[PDB]
Amino acid sequence: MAHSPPGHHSVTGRPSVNGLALAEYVIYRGEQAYPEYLITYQIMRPE
Amino acid sequence: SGTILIDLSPDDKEFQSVEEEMQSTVREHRDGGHAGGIFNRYNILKIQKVCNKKLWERYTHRRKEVSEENHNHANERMLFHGSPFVNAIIHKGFDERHAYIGGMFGAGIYFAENSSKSNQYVYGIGGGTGCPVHKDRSCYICHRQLLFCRVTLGKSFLQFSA
Ligand SMILES: Cc1ccc2sc3nncn3c2c1
Ligand SMILES: [Zn+2]
């Protein structure tokens, strides 16, 4: 696993083309996330 | 492992706010649905609360460290994570085995505000070969799992990117 950029705890990937896209985030320490909810689902076929 | 899964009732305000964040963050993907399938919404089958004393104290311990390095600001988000290894994550927690070495921002653990983005990774990088049973990245039958995770960002490096 790589290191955060010096002086940073994470990386934000900000969308700079696709106007509808929300952000993605990267952490470099497993201890910086807690898996609070397990969601079981199916994707639905559009009508 | 120490992990117990508590079923939330569909009547529970917690089930309802988690379902709304799942449904409201679906978007169209530039791959036209290649990795994650073609869909506008989900059928939510179950929401379970993940309870592990040891993994929670490991989280709050690191969260206090980050906040003390960032003017008492953890910069905590709720974000989606998709992985074939959710069973290992809920029992043993996140670690370097859940990193992506070839990710656009290097070997780290990736999270998304878009549930539909995390959906592209449930069956592997770019959807892998799709569901175990039908080898179908757009399977409407097989049950998928996502995590909705508490994530400490602290001071985040801003990358402008396509
Ligand atoms: C490699 C990669 C890049 C972006 C994302 S956003 C997300 N949500 N769950 C997994 N991921 C990933 C994985
Ligand atoms: Zn299937």
Author numbering:
A (entry chain A): 1115 to 1161
B (entry chain AAA): 951 to 1112
Text from the published report:
Shifting of the methyl group to other positions did not have major effects on the potency (3, 4, and 9), and all compounds maintained μM potencies for the tested enzymes. Compound 3 having the methyl in the C-6 position, however, showed higher potency against PARP2 and TNKS2. The TNKS2 crystal structure in complex with 3 revealed that 6-methyl pushed Tyr1050 to a different conformation and provided the additional interaction explaining the poly-ART selectivity.
The human diphtheria toxin-like ARTD family contains PARP and tankyrase (TNKS) enzymes that can catalyze both mono-ADP-ribosylation (MAR, mono-ARTs) as well as generate elongated and branched chains of poly-ADP-ribose (PAR, poly-ARTs). The PARPs and TNKSs form a family of structurally and functionally diverse enzymes, which are involved in the regulation of various key biological and pathological processes such as DNA repair, cell differentiation, gene transcription, and signal transduction pathways. Here, we report our contribution in identifying a set of compounds based on a new nicotinamide mimicking chemotype,triazolo[3,4-b]benzothiazole (TBT), able to inhibit different PARP family enzymes with submicromolar activity depending on the substitution pattern around the central core.
